[PDB]
Design a protein around this ligand. Sequence first.
Ligand SMILES: [Cu+2]
Ligand SMILES: [Cu+2]
Ligand SMILES: [Cu+2]
Ligand SMILES: [Cu+2]
Lengths: 123, 123, 123, 123
Amino acid sequence: ATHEVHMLNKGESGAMVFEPAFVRAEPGDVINFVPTDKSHNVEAIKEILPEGVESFKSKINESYTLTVTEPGLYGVKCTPHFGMGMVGLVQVGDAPENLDAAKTAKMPKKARERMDAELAQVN
Amino acid sequence: ATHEVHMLNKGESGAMVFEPAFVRAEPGDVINFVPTDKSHNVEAIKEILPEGVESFKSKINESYTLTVTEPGLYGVKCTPHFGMGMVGLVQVGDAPENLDAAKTAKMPKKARERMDAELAQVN
Amino acid sequence: ATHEVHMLNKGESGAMVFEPAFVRAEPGDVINFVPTDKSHNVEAIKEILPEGVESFKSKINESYTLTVTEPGLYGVKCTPHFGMGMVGLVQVGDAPENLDAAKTAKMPKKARERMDAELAQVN
Amino acid sequence: ATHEVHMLNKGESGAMVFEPAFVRAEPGDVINFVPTDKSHNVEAIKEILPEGVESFKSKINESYTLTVTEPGLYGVKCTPHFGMGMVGLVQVGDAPENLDAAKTAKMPKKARERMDAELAQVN
Ligand SMILES: [Cu+2]
Ligand SMILES: [Cu+2]
Ligand SMILES: [Cu+2]
Ligand SMILES: [Cu+2]
């Protein structure tokens, strides 16, 4: 299954957001990160990735296709807007092993707020 | 401004969801609830409404337009899927007075989980 | 099956548009007409409706749910923006009987341009 | 500005489509082609490109970002689905010089049908 995430200046939840900010996916699914508005990218949050998953960082304004082969949590940020709290979370499969890492990862205050909100969606 | 909320069997955050589940709006805005999938409606959570706002309850399978004139939090549920956690939250203006009412409102376990996730977005 | 059509100020195809401007649907499907931007509505083009289908006209800024029970072509306009060419076309089933009516219906020049474009999608 | 085009097995206009199939853009804009469904790519129709623009051909299942620097018409096809009519058209600037080239370019019957529909949108 394929899921789409937009990078927005002003979304339903607030400013400088990934929308949806949380995706529950299954191993092997595809996540498409697509700008709606210019100025944004998608970059892995190093500390919030499953074992073995390589970091990624897209170029500003390009669509990025992520295949989530590995189960766990994948945290993403928008590089220029990380401090503005522009972060997203993809849960791949049940009972992610790296939940504690996602809860304790250091990031800017507003990013940590939005990440805690996303974590509240884990199921 | 208009805002759109989809009523879904299976959304990015899980089964039986409003998507987006949280909307930040301004006084006077309209929230359109869209029957993307059949079987859903929108109904006020009477314990999560600003002062002076009337309850509402749409018919299954219809569009519903909520005009949010008064500031504060508006909780919504889908009537047949309340116990499956199909609840949403609209924040109108800054510093909603009824935050605590929304934190404590009685509801089915899964609805309370989702509602806590929505609350985590208030800003 | 359900299909969604947005009412936009500026879409990929131009200004004051329904997007998608053409939907191929099957009898019994649902069309959701949803504003993305304020100022728009959906109204039937009288002369482009199947036999027996009643006209409709939504209120500005509200989502409108149309069940396309009857086969044929359903032409729609946005009332205030008809002259700006804000029109859409829904083909319900094969070989619509009212094709000639859709080709010859009088409307403002820009509406006729966009309707001819939509007609070029009939299949 | 960014623009998004989805690559779909089944879209609103029929099977094997770019959606939107026609994009109006400005010099410098980017067009993101998004693999919403697998099995697709984007490839230039070399007979429908402005002067001085290089051909391109993406890999199946990947995002592709086309930067449209030069004014005129850019025709695109999905390589495995060209005969199934999976073609798109991007208009960059006013009064494209290569309109006639796009009207007459040789292609499979269904691709020519879709391409004529896209052309009907040029303005
Ligand atoms: Cu950003
Ligand atoms: Cu429901
Ligand atoms: Cu309009
Ligand atoms: Cu294809």
